[PDB]
Design a protein around this ligand. Structure first.
Ligand code: SF4
Ligand code: SF4
Ligand code: SF4
Ligand code: SF4
Ligand code: SF4
Ligand code: SF4
Ligand code: FES
Lengths: 145, 154, 196, 377, 127, 754
């Protein structure tokens, strides 16, 4: 069954389906928090967007926030501090939020322009449609679980 | 407004670009000065000795490997500032989100002036056979981006 | 002018007076006399307590009395009754083996959050604080970050093909106690200052 | 009955009934640790690390720091740089405030007035992009003066916005002054006794909102504020109603600093031409061996300030701010203690909202205008 | 004057003879150094004909027996120079109007250049 | 001592002191280009100028502080506007004709000229500052030109100090570099093209700018980008402090680490340019034999496969063979593993018939202080740095005083072009040895004949004239020192007479052992037992190897485990379980010097792959043999050594040992001890670490051997191709083979295949 035109052509329908019923749930931290409240102002939830330096004290928290979510779910990482440790390489900051949660898309910027974070979700958008590959040529799995 | 292109100022800090002279030589002389001033340790440089017959730059030194981690990068323009040659100059691109951490480390060939599009843009525009459409417009190009043809209708 | 009455007093009483040509001045009190002497300072008209800055001197090129020291910033708000605007710093060196130093909690209420940060980040204990609890550093973190011999905790940054960078092995910038990349350092790179 | 309510701040509000027994705050959630990681960077490199704490009125951190250093090695800020630094500083003040004001226009239901506050700010930020190429964290201030000169388009555009603000700020004062609901919302709540604010160090320009005349640009003048026409707003009894208003008044006095400084703007240099402190002119890097040596040396291992300790206090949109820099004669700073206005400001929040209601306790914090970046850093 | 441009024009040609004699008598021609006023010229304009400021004719060991150079665009008293390294003999070619490239009063033709390079090659070249 | 007052600070300081040292000694500073630790000072750059007061009676002109002595009650001003104006001017005269390469130049942030310019130049006169005054055509000359395959020369950057040419004349003594023309026209050049001496890499660390640079490492990274790993060089017994520079796992460049007690600030060329091979081709996983061939196996699959080949083994049939550069810890465990597991045969790659522990170790210090120097062997090749302590010893130089800043910057004691004393030493070697020049009493013998020369010196026979003048010299010698290396230490006869001569006269010895950690492994009891099976004698039946032995010792054995780092052809054909091992560059622990000093090894961030140190591999092969080992890791191993009571870093460990196992000599061939080691013939060291065959021009051409032909040759130690050389100093009818391993100073059979 799982690999049969029928099944597959459902799960491609379902994906295209919640490819548009994506419900961003922003998770503001520092400076990045405010630069997203400029894209929210311009237009139960899946797709947490991590926006700012994730402290080590703050980490176990964002952990639970993420766990206690529905299941078809995705994470976006906003700017340098979420993506890598940022310019902040030290005892107090997590060096890639992917240490704690599966990052689906990464968006460079410090902070990233509002209009770039739009592009960021058009990416994760076209990714849950399962229409996205990396630079090696491989097709990428819609959800990181 | 992913329908109407966003106007950014000509000074904006976008995807780094490496430039060439008219001669066509690359401006870069792999001195690794840009990397040395980077507060975020996001530039890696491996130098190389020019080939007298087939030159890359002007001196006796050009940049074999030139790599910037776009995740580490903060976008100061400190690198553009430390450069002695006018080689590394931040440009305009910003639409450069992606999925796999190590795909976002741009290379010399992602940044040369001739290049048009960010890594993800060109890649998608690869498996699609459709030209790259940038999402920006600028009143004009800085003098420092001499060559970098981009959407400047203003 | 409330400040001259501090200085005229420390001069007679054997307190060292520190002065840089830039606009700040200190007065270094011994361990014992610190407690009470400071209470006397508020009574003298010293309204507001600006900051309290902890200092670790372990990797300092020139030698100092003891390893740790705390600095306070006492002021008299110019926006009140008879405020001068007399401000100044008071310093107390504190032994490496005895991180003990009384609280100013009785006197100034600012010293609340400010003393706990100096305790969290430097290992310095304050006799009689309402509750000496960590402030900024995660609960389970062991030790005291802001003091010299505790690792910045860096990670190598990564690039394409086994190409990494270790910041601690990359920094071109010298660090006071460092002789540098040639044999020695002297001249303007031993410390430099213009002559306005 | 102890409830655990927790911007990115967490509060252990102990409360039986409906009053408020004691609020015990817990911070450390945006603790990036700037003060340690800065003992490990150039003086030039730290100019990227200052804007990231108060990311709202960020330029004040830039300036506060540049100030303590310039003093330290003795640099002369060119007239044109001094001028551009106050225009720029205050243009950033309005950005922070506009936000505090904006967050208020929503607790208050006023919606078209807010959709405007956002548009103002966006027009301030585009100006920043015009000269610095960024919305924030502009690497523009320098130890000598400023990174580069400002573009041709900047004056004409600053004129547009400096033209519609004058009465614009008044309009906001109006909606809050003629306080329909606001009165019954903020007037009584959040008691700040003049003489207790001066005990807990609530420098926050919501200090003068409770009858204290202390603004550092006046008491300890710095970047040539010493020579500007300057009104320091005050508030009667330290409630939240006055705190909200004080900040709106501060907006005019900013706008006036701007106009005033904008006049005395004549062409010239923009940073101290001292070779020891400032990298050589760009064009002669193709001619002077000395230039090259200087340039090369400058950008690798920085310059070396003398062994000594310094502190200059400055005024932000949140109170006293200033860096305590211990120099050891190196390429990097030996200690960098930042006076967080927002950190001391919060010790005055347990008292602020004690015995009061509860849903009020939102506005009772918003009025203290805290930015976590500042408190935690 | 505009001589500066015609002198640089003449720098190209001397270089031309160098590359010729080089391939011809099968001896290493080595570009010794580029103009830093090109390498470090940034957005700034550059109209010079070449980017090579110091040339040489070296032997098998690579030790040169002939060295050539012209002065940068920003330096004073521009001359083009010829030096026989190790034999203490320096030349200074200027540029006169109508006359052409001169070492004072004697014209510096291809022929005369070839003569010097030969003398040098036979005498100086170690291998 | 004498009282000097620098600026506002007064200091004690011995009479001979350079004002430059007295200045730095008070904690001050001054521009300093042409002077160098351990070189003759001359005021040539004119940078170190001070003002001198001497009664206050300021002298009228400014003094070169580096060549001015200090007088009692003297004042030295280094801050006056008169001083500083002069300095900034002298910095300007330097940068005047300089090229403008800083970004492109490999002399990066480690360039004295750069640092001194930003320190003392561009003088503040009391708006727009003037950076450059000189506006003419700078000096244009020869650029980027290699002097040797190890050294590349930029003449345009040279600042005419004398650091290099001075050094060649003074320290190793090989005048292969000098200036040429004069005026503004002068330059550095050579006529001895190769760059002859084996100490030519040192000019690399001295040259104050990037004229003379290390080509082995051209264009790799900027100096700050390199992570620097201080350790010891284990390529021989001297154990010079070094610095290993690395970026991203690969080995970039070797430099010298000052360590005045032993080598001062000098490295030998093999010590510094033979790193090509340690980062280039290497075995990264454990190998095991399956179908007549080896294949990839985890450490898991290889710990079992190792339990197999040894389950069928009695504990007395076990061999424990380490390499010459094994750590002091790796030798202690192996001693204990072989003690509990009662075996007679456990040995190390370089072990000498006569133990170096026989003799009382002498400190390099002692050598400078000694009166007579009796030498049998070639220091140049056996223990290269000894060449350089003898250059100092010959000149009568003695251990400098130690200031606050350590070794003096301007030792007035070193005069330039000093006379060399030929009455102070005597050399005895199978050839015209290098330092035989600085020795009156010199005589060229033939291989393994020292046995007889030594008998003569005792006083029981009749040696040649030289050997008589030499006996008489050691006779009148007041406190002489004995140095001896190959044949003496490899031949029980000589070595026994050796230790006797030096016993009668209370004098210490320098054993130039062919094994690097020789004196220390011996100190750990890593010497074979009664049985006999030595590192070259195929004896045991199941054995561990820390190297590649003679093909003769492998062939036969039932189980073999080679713990190599690279893959030899002799292992991929006779080996059962091969294990990746780390080089000494990436090891950790201690060694012991040819002078008995214990030196530390620190681990470079090089590409180890899945490699584990012999300390681990040994513990792992002790399990598969029964007893659980007493050593796991370095921290804990440290307690065991500290138990036997071996002194901390830098301390000397006294340990004598009377016992010697002789072996006969099939004298046809001689393994001429060489500096370059055989596994360094990679890349650039490719041509310099090739092998050689030396014979007298008659016998040479008698056995059909042209002066420059590529001959194949076979020994008990393997088949090696080799260039053939005519030498009138080689004893007739013998052939000298380049012993490019730790099997130097040996006599063996073999012949020339055609
Ligand atoms: S990435 Fe930059 S803008 Fe975003 S939280 Fe980090 S410092 Fe702030
Ligand atoms: S913009 Fe700044 S953070 Fe980015 S590569 Fe350049 S120097 Fe580094
Ligand atoms: S971009 Fe500029 S600074 Fe960076 S290596 Fe190239 S020339 Fe040097
Ligand atoms: S030798 Fe020193 S001054 Fe000369 S180009 Fe090289 S780094 Fe610059
Ligand atoms: S090549 Fe270097 S060490 Fe030799 S004289 Fe020139 S500057 Fe001095
Ligand atoms: S003399 Fe020996 S220890 Fe010293 S550098 Fe040479 S090989 Fe290494
Ligand atoms: S003259 Fe060169 S250092 Fe004394």
């Amino acid at each position: 069954e799982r690999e049969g035109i029928l099944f597959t052509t459902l799960e491609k329908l379902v994906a295209w389906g919640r490819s548009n019923s994506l419900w961003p749930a922003t998770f503001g931290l520092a400076c990045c928090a405010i630069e997203m409240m400029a894209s929210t102002d311009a237009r139960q939830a899946d797709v947490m967007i991590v926006a700012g330096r994730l402290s080590k004290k703050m980490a176990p928290v964002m952990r639970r926030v993420w766990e206690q979510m529905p299941d078809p779910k995705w994470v976006i990482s906003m700017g340098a501090c979420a993506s890598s440790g940022g310019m902040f390489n030290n005892y107090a900051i997590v060096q890639n939020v992917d240490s704690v949660v599966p990052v689906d898309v990464y968006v460079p910027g410090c902070p990233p322009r509002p209009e770039a974070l739009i592009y960021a979700v058009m990416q994760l958008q076209k990714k849950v449609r399962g229409q996205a590959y990396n630079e090696r040529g491989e097709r990428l799995p819609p959800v990181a679980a | 407004y992913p329908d109407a292109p966003v106007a950014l100022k000509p000074r904006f800090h976008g995807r780094h670009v490496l430039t060439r002279h008219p001669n066509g030589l690359e401006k870069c002389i792999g001195c690794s000065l840009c990397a040395a001033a980077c507060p975020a340790y996001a530039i890696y440089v491996e130098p190389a000795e020019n080939d007298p017959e087939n030159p890359v730059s002007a001196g006796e030194r050009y940049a074999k490997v030139y790599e910037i981690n776009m995740l580490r990068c903060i976008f100061c323009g400190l690198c553009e500032e430390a450069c002695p040659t006018g080689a590394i100059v931040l440009g305009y691109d910003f639409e450069m989100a992606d999925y796999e951490y190590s795909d976002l480390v741009y290379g010399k060939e992602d940044m040369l002036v001739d290049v048009v599009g960010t890594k993800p843009q060109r890649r998608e525009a690869k498996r699609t056979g459709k030209p790259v459409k940038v999402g920006y417009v600028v009143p004009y190009v800085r003098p420092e981006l001499e060559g970098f043809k981009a959407p400047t209708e203003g | 002018m409330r400040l001259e009455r501090v200085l005229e007093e420390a001069r007679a009483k054997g307190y060292p007076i520190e002065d840089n040509g830039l606009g700040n001045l200190w007065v270094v009190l011994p361990r014992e006399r610190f407690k009470e002497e400071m209470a006397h300072y508020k009574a003298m008209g010293f309204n507001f307590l600006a900051d309290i800055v902890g200092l670790d001197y372990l990797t300092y090129p020139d030698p100092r009395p003891e390893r740790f020291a705390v600095v306070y910033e006492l002021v008299s708000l110019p926006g009140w009754k008879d405020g001068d605007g007399s401000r100044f710093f008071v310093r107390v060196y504190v032994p490496e083996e005895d991180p003990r130093l009384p609280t100013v909690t009785d006197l100034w209420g600012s010293a609340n959050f400010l003393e706990r940060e100096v305790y969290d980040l430097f290992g310095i204990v304050f006799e009689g604080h309402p509750d000496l609890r960590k402030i900024l550093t995660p609960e389970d973190l062991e030790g005291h970050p802001l003091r010299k011999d505790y690792p910045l905790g860096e990670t190598p940054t990564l690039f394409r093909e086994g190409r990494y960078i270790i910041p601690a092995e990359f920094r071109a910038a010298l660090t006071g106690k460092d002789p540098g990349l040639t044999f020695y350092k002297g001249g303007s790179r031993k410390g430099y200052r213009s002559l306005w | 009955m102890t409830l655990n309510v927790g911007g990115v701040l967490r509060l252990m509000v102990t409360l039986s009934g409906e009053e408020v027994l004691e609020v015990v705050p817990h911070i450390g959630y945006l603790h990036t640790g700037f003060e340690k990681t800065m003992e490990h960077r150039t003086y030039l490199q730290n100019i990227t690390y200052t804007p990231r704490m108060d990311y709202l009125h960020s330029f004040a951190h830039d300036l506060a720091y540049a100030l303590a250093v310039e003093k330290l090695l003795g640099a002369v800020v060119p007239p044109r740089a001094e001028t551009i630094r106050v225009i720029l500083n205050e243009l950033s003040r309005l950005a922070s405030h506009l936000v505090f004001l904006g967050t208020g226009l929503l607790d208050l239901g006023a919606l078209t007035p807010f959709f405007y506050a956002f548009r103002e700010r966006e027009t301030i930020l585009d100006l920043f992009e015009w000269v610095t190429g960024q919305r924030f964290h502009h690497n523009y201030i320098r130890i000598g003066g400023v990174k580069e000169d400002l573009p041709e388009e900047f004056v004409p555009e600053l004129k547009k916005l400096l033209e519609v603000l004058p009465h614009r700020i008044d309009e906001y004062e109006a909606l809050f002054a003629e306080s329909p609901i606001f009165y019954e919302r903020a007037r009584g709540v959040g008691v700040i006794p003049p003489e207790v604010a001066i005990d807990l160090g609530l420098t926050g320009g919501s200090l003068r909102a409770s009858g204290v005349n202390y603004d550092v640009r006046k008491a300890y003048p710095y970047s040539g504020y010493e020579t500007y026409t300057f009104d320091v707003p005050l508030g009667e009894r330290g409630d939240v109603f006055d705190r909200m208003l004080v900040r709106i008044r501060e907006m005019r006095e900013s706008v006036k600093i701007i106009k005033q400084a904008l006049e005395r703007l004549e062409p010239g240099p923009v940073r101290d031409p001292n070779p020891q402190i400032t990298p050589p002119p760009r064009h002669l890097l193709e001619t002077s061996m000395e230039a090259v040596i200087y340039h090369f040396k400058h950008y690798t291992e920085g310059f070396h300030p003398p062994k000594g300790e310094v502190y200059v206090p400055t005024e932000s949109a949140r109170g006293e701010l200033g860096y305590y820099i211990v120099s050891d004669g190196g390429s990097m700073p030996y200690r960098v203690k930042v006076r967080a206005p927002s950190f001391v400001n919060l010790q005055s929040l347990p008292y602020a909202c004690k015995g009061e209601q509860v849903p009020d306790m939102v506005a009772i914090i918003a009025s203290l205008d805290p930015v976590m970046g500042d408190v935690d850093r | 004057a505009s001589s500066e441009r015609e002198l640089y024009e003449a720098w190209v040609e001397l270089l031309s003879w160098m590359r010729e004699y080089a391939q011809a008598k099968g001896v290493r021609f080595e570009k010794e150094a580029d103009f830093p006023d090109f390498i470090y010229r940034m957005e700034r304009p550059y109209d010079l004909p070449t980017t090579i400021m110091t040339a040489s004719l070296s032997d098998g060991l690579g030790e040169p027996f002939l060295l050539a150079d012209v002065s940068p665009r920003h330096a004073k008293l521009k001359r083009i120079g010829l030096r026989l390294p190790r034999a203490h003999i320096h030349l200074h070619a200027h540029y006169e109007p109508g006359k052409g490239l001169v070492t004072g009063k004697i014209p510096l033709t291809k022929e005369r250049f070839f003569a010097l390079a030969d003398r040098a090659r036979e005498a100086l070249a170690f291998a | 001592m004498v009282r000097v007052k620098v600026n506002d600070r007064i200091v004690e300081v011995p009479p001979g002191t350079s004002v430059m040292d007295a200045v730095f000694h008070a904690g001050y500073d001054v521009p300093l280009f042409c002077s160098e630790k351990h070189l003759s000072p001359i005021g040539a750059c004119r940078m170190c100028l001070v003002r001198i007061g001497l009664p206050i009676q300021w002298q009228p002109k400014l003094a070169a502080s580096c060549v001015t002595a200090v007088a009692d009650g003297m004042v030295v001003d280094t801050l006056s506007d008169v001083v500083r104006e002069a300095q900034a001017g002298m910095v300007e005269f330097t940068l005047l004709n300089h090229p403008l390469d800083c970004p492109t130049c490999d002399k990066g942030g480690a360039c004295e000229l750069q640092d001194r310019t930003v320190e003392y130049g561009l003088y503040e006169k009391y708006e727009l500052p003037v950076y450059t005054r000189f506006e003419f055509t700078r000096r244009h000359v020869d650029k980027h030109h290699p002097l040797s395959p190890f050294v590349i020369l930029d003449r345009e950057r040279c600042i005419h100090c004398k650091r290099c040419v001075r050094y060649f004349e003074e320290v190793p003594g090989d005048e292969v570099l000098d200036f040429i023309e004069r005026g503004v026209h002068t330059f550095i050049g050579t006529m001895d093209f190769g760059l002859p001496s084996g100490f030519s890499g040192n000019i690399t660390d001295i040259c104050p700018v990037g004229a003379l640079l290390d080509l082995t490492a051209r264009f790799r990274a900027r100096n700050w980008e390199m992570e620097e790993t201080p350790t010891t060089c284990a390529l021989c017994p001297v154990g010079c402090g070094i610095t290993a520079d690395t970026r991203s796992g690969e080995l970039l460049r070797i430099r010298a680490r000052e360590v005045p007690e032993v080598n001062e600030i000098w490295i030998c060329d093999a010590g510094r340019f033979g790193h090509e091979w340690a980062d280039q081709n290497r075995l990264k996983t454990p190998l095991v034999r399956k179908e007549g061939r080896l294949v990839e196996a985890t450490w898991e699959e290889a710990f079992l496969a190792l339990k197999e080949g040894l389950k069928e083994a009695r504990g007395e049939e076990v061999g424990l063979y380490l390499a010459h550069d094994a750590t002091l810890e790796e030798g202690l465990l192996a001693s204990e593993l072989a003690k509990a597991l009662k075996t007679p045969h456990l040995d190390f790659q370089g072990r000498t018939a006569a133990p170096a522990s026989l003799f009382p170790p002498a400190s390099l210090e002692d050598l400078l202080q000694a009166d007579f120097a009796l030498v049998l062997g070639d220091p140049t090749e056996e223990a290269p740095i000894l060449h350089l302590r003898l250059s100092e010893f010959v000149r009568d130089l003695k251990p400098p005083h130690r200031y606050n800043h350590g070794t003096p910057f301007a030792d007035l004691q070193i005069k330039e072009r000093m006379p060399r004393r030929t009455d102070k030493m005597a050399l005895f070697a199978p050839y015209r040895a290098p330092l035989m020049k600085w020795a009156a009493i010199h005589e060229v013998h033939r291989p393994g004949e020292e046995r007889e020369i030594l008998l003569a010196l005792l006083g029981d026979k009749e040696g040649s004239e030289m050997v008589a003048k030499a006996k008489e010299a050691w006779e009148k010698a007041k406190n002489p020192v004995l140095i001896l290396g190959a044949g003496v230490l490899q031949d029980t006869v000589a070595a026994e007479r050796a230790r006797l001569l030096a016993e009668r006269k209370g004098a210490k010895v320098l054993a130039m052992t062919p094994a690097a950690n020789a004196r220390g492994l011996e100190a750990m009891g890593v010497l074979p037992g009664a049985k006999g099976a030595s590192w070259d004698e195929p004896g045991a039946l199941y054995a561990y190897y820390g190297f590649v032995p003679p093909e003769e010792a492998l062939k036969g054995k039932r189980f073999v485990v080679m713990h190599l780092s690279h893959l030899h052809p002799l292992a991929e054909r006779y080996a059962h379980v091969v294990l990746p091992a780390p080089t000494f560059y990436e090891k950790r622990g201690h060694l012991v010097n040819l002078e008995g000093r214990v030196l530390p090894l620190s681990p470079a961030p090089i590409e180890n792959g899945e490699a584990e140190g012999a300390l681990q591999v040994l513990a792992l092969l002790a399990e598969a043999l029964g007893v659980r080992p007493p050593f796991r890791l370095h921290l804990e191993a440290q307690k065991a050594l500290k138990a036997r009571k071996v002194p901390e870093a830098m301390g000397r460990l006294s340990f004598r040992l009377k016992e010697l196992r002789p072996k006969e000599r099939k004298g046809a061939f001689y393994l001429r001890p060489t500096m370059w080691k055989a596994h360094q013939a990679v890349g650039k060291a490719q041509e310099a670490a090739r092998a050689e065959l030396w014979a007298h021009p008659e016998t040479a051409r008698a056995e059909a051997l042209p002066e420059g032909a590529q001959v194949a040759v076979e020994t008990p130690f393997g088949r090696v191709e080799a260039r053939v050389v005519h030498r009138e100093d080689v004893p007739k009818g013998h052939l000298y083979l380049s012993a490019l391993g730790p099997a130097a100073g040996l006599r063996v059979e073999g012949r020339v295949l055609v």
